[PDB]
Design a binder for this molecule. Structure first.
Ligand SMILES: N[C@@H]1CO[C@H](CNC(=O)c2ccc(F)cc2)[C@H]1O
Length: 339
């Protein structure tokens, strides 16, 4: 379809111009008031902040340079910021500013007050097939966009899908995203979502994102993931086995799509065949989906999150509030020169 082809050609031109000349140093810490911690991690946290002059709210991701180095995430952190400042798509959280100081790296993103898909899924138990299909269609279009730019995402899971005020998805956390034209080798991702070729230490490609979509659709429609077990070693054994059990309430069309996404042989997996993404878009499970209307945000969403305004944090959870310290001496300057 020439209209999709010309869309993706323009998308790649615009991405490459920003990729080749990344923006740097577009804000500073004392232009923001700190409001609340929204999430934590091994080397960083995300905080709700308010810009002092405009009053706008943002989600500020703060990474400690010394911890990034110790946990061997330097390349990944540079990938994350360089990719985020270059992309533009309706279902991706937008990077608004970035900067660094003696101690930390900062990525200031749009704030999405509806919270994570994960919270809403675990509260209701499972989504109906139409509800799962609405979110799945947005991921299919997002992966078509990213893959056309030679980007692998590598972190699909319900916690990384935020729900906006119109009920649409915004994908966040580009910590494992990478520009890859062929194969890549790093072990990364949450256990339940890993493709077999990652578990087996192979050189793998963008087909791992389509496997992860299969896991996400199964979990949305069942309420639990397909390879669930109590410990990672047992999860990994189930993933590599080539078997799955579907609930009887799944439609036949859903089962068929999932068998083709959760295909252990990556050379036979939907999304990775000669027709690429069109084997997924044209599948019977998606027959009711108007792909253009989803992209244009014209479909009424199945669920509108409840929140009081752009400063409401009620859909995120509570964490111990810790200082943001900035040393008087510069740390790890060489490693993060390009940030
Ligand atoms: N666990 C670590 C700390 O929290 C990170 C993920 N959270 C976001 O990316 C985010 C949250 C809300 C929002 F409005 C925008 C972005 C993760 O790396």
């Amino acid at each position: 379809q020439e209209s999709v082809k010309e869309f993706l050609a323009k998308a790649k031109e615009e991405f490459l111009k920003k990729w080749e000349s990344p923006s740097q140093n577009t804000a500073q810490l004392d232009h923001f008031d700190r409001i609340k911690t929204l999430g934590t991690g091994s080397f960083g946290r995300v905080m709700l902040v308010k810009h002092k002059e405009t009053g706008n709210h943002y989600a500020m991701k703060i990474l400690d340079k010394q911890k990034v180095v110790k946990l061997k995430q330097i390349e990944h952190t540079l990938n994350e910021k360089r990719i985020l400042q270059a992309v533009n798509f309706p279902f991706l959280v937008k990077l608004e500013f970035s900067f660094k100081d003696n101690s930390n790296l900062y990525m200031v993103m749009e704030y999405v007050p509806g919270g994570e898909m994960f919270s809403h899924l675990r509260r209701i138990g499972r989504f109906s097939e139409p509800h799962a299909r609405f979110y799945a269609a947005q991921i299919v279009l997002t992966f078509e966009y990213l893959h056309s730019l030679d980007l692998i995402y590598r972190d699909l899971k319900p916690e990384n899908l935020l729900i906006d005020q119109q009920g649409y998805i915004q994908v966040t956390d580009f910590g494992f995203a990478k520009r890859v034209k062929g194969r890549t080798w790093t072990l990364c991702g949450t256990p339940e979502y890993l493709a077999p070729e990652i578990i087996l230490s192979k050189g793998y490609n963008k087909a791992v994102d389509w496997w992860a979509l299969g896991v996400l659709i199964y979990e949305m429609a069942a309420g639990y993931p397909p390879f669930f077990a109590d410990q990672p070693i047992q999860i990994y054994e189930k993933i590599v086995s080539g078997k799955v059990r579907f609930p009887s309430h799944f439609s036949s069309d859903l089962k068929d799509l999932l068998r083709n996404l959760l295909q252990v042989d990556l050379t036979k997996r939907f999304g990775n065949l000669k027709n690429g993404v069109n084997d997924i878009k044209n599948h019977k499970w998606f027959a009711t989906t108007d792909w253009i209307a989803i992209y244009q945000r014209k479909v009424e969403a199945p669920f509108i999150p409840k929140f009081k305004g752009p400063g409401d944090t009620s859909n995120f959870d509570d964490y111990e509030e810790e200082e943001i310290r900035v040393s008087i001496n510069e740390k790890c300057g060489k490693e993060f020169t390009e940030f």
